[PDB]
């Protein structure tokens, strides 16, 4: 099993729908088009995710104020979390190219949501950490996610028209998400 | 000659976020002062294309019901004197992204146009009588298209492939700042 990776069996429902995603994914013009893509670039990350999540937590773990997120309150990072978080990140990658993207997938993002904030950071790997994620973050980090995973959607030899698409789908997926994963920081009716 | 609704610089609140927030967050989305030479550069390429900019911008928008719904009177038809006066402001937007130092003033009004998409200061500057708040959910996602929008006008005026790339990812880190930014008003106090 991956310790935490509790997909298809979240404790609550999304407060959001399927129509309410139809026109999210309008929002940030995702199409079927964007479904065949974001499925290849499973298919060519998949086997460089050692790599990858090399690399995130490189990102992560030179900036103070990020790795932060991830320390005890003696201020040291706590490398079981880092760890542990890891492995939800690595099948995470392969989720967001590989799952449909209905109910369980929303029950999951709301859920990951949850995990970020407040409401449910810390209670996954039963750690002791700093409380919250400030949302501000979040949604930055969309740009580090996509510059991340660009350089290795070349990898496999894909033509670059394939991987510019490949790049655009995983950049709106990750808009997609972060984008529900507000959901538990905003005032409430203001979603 | 002055932008109806256009306040930079003059605003009637400080920025809840510093100087020191905003470092941070530019380190979170990459942002270094070599994106600082590469939007001035998308400013010089975007500025004489605004109108094709913003027609285009319009026709995203007006593309989807639940999207030009937050320009709407109450009987559902869109607010032209709004759309109007919002299309002024938008094609400043774009001069200021490229142009303005990222400064405190810039800070201030960055709180003033998340304010206008939240509730508390939606449809205010234009007198308009509209939908009262844009749901945050969009905001975030329009960081997808705005970026859309702007790629195939930064090749027109013949930048390489490579000089392209910089310019919109640039563009990229900067909508993406500025969204996160936005989102303050639309936050439980305390988490963002
Ligand atoms: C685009 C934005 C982000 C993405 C795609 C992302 C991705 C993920 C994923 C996939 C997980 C595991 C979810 C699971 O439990 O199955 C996770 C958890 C976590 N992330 Fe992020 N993340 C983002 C933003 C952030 C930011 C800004 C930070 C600050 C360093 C951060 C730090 C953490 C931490 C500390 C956890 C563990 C939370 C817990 O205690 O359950 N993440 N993230
Ligand atoms: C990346 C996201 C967005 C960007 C960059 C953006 C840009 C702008 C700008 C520059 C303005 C004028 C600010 C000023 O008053 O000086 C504005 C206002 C406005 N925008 Fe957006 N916007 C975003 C998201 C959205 C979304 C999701 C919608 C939904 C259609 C929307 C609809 C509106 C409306 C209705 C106003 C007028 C608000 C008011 O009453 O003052 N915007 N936007
Ligand atoms: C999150 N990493
Ligand atoms: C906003 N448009």
Same mark, same amino acid.
């Not at 509790?6 to 429902?13: H, I, L, V």
């Not at 499925?39 to 490189?58: H, Y």
């Not at 950490?129 to 740009?143: D, E, K, T």
């Given at each position: 099993?991956?310790?935490?990776?509790?997909?298809? +069996?979240? =404790?609550?429902?999304?407060?959001?729908?399927? #129509?309410? $995603?139809?026109?999210?994914? /309008?929002?940030?013009?995702? @199409?079927? +088009?964007? =479904?065949?893509?974001?499925?290849?670039?499973? #298919?060519? $990350?998949?086997?460089?995710? /050692?790599?990858?999540?090399? @690399?995130?937590?490189?990102?992560?773990?030179?900036?103070?104020?990020?790795?932060?997120?991830?320390?005890?309150?003696?201020?040291?990072?706590?490398?079981?979390?880092?760890?542990?978080?890891?492995?939800?990140?690595?099948?995470?990658?392969?989720?967001?190219?590989?799952?449909?993207?209905?109910?369980?997938?929303?029950?999951?993002?709301?859920?990951?949501?949850?995990?970020?904030?407040?409401?449910?950071?810390?209670?996954?790997?039963?750690?002791?950490?700093?409380?919250?994620?400030?949302?501000?973050?979040?949604?930055?980090?969309?740009?580090?996610?996509?510059?991340?995973?660009?350089?290795?959607?070349?990898?496999?030899?894909?033509?670059?028209?394939?991987?510019?698409?490949?790049?655009?789908?995983?950049?709106?997926?990750?808009?997609?998400?972060?984008?529900?994963?507000?959901?538990?920081?905003?005032?409430?009716?203001?979603?």
């Amino acid at each position: 099993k991956i310790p935490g990776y509790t997909y298809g +069996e979240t =404790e609550n429902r999304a407060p959001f729908n399927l #129509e309410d $995603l139809k026109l999210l994914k /309008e929002a940030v013009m995702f @199409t079927a +088009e964007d =479904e065949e893509y974001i499925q290849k670039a499973g #298919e060519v $990350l998949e086997d460089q995710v /050692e790599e990858i999540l090399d @690399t995130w937590a490189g990102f992560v773990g030179s900036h103070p104020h990020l790795l932060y997120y991830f320390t005890s309150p003696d201020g040291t990072p706590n490398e079981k979390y880092l760890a542990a978080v890891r492995k939800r990140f690595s099948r995470w990658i392969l989720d967001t190219s590989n799952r449909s993207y209905d109910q369980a997938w929303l029950d999951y993002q709301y859920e990951i949501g949850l995990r970020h904030h407040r409401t449910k950071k810390n209670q996954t790997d039963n750690v002791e950490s700093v409380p919250n994620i400030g949302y501000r973050y979040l949604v930055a980090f969309i740009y580090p996610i996509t510059a991340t995973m660009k350089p290795f959607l070349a990898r496999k030899g894909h033509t670059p028209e394939e991987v510019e698409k490949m790049y655009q789908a995983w950049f709106k997926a990750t808009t997609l998400q972060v984008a529900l994963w507000s959901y538990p920081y905003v005032k409430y009716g203001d979603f």
